[PDB]
Swiss-Prot record, chain A:
Effect annotated for changing N9K: In strain: Omicron/BA.1
Functional summary from the UniProt entry: Subunit of the fusion protein that is processed upon entry into the host cell. Mediates fusion of the virion and cellular membranes by functioning as a class I viral fusion protein. Contains a viral fusion peptide that is unmasked after S2 cleavage. This cleavage can occur at the cell membrane by host TMPRSS2 or during endocytosis by host CSTL. In either case, this triggers an extensive and irreversible conformational change that leads to fusion of the viral envelope with the cellular cytoplasmic membrane, releasing viral genomic RNA into the host cell cytoplasm.
Protein's name according to its UniProt entry: Spike protein S2'
Shown stretch of the complete protein: 848 to 887 of 1273
Length: 40, 49
């Protein structure tokens, strides 16, 4: 359906390769590694 | 439409044109809506995907 005026003049927006639900999983993995191991 | 040429999908609008207004424009000066010269209904123009 209708989106915007920028989208209709050749100006498109590409989605990021990493979604937020996986950036958050990377962050959670970093936090868990810090808690369980430390700097090791 | 009345000499105004273009390409797109003519849906039906909820726009309320005043009697002296025939076509409408957006910030890019592209006609976003036109008034049918005969049935006098407001059609929403959106270029094809
Ligand atoms: C011309 O006549 C009527 C009244 O103006 C209009 O609504 C109708 O669409 C027109 N007829 C056509 C284009 O056949």
């Amino acid at each position: 359906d209708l989106i915007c005026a920028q989208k209709f003049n050749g100006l498109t927006v590409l989605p990021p390769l990493l979604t937020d639900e996986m950036i958050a999983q990377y962050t959670s993995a970093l936090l868990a590694g810090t808690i369980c191991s430390g700097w090791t | 439409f009345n000499g105004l040429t273009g390409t797109g999908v003519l849906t039906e609008s909820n726009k309320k044109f005043l009697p002296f207004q025939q076509f409408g424009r957006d910030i890019a000066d592209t006609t976003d809506a036109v008034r049918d010269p005969q049935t006098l209904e407001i059609l929403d123009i959106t270029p094809c995907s």
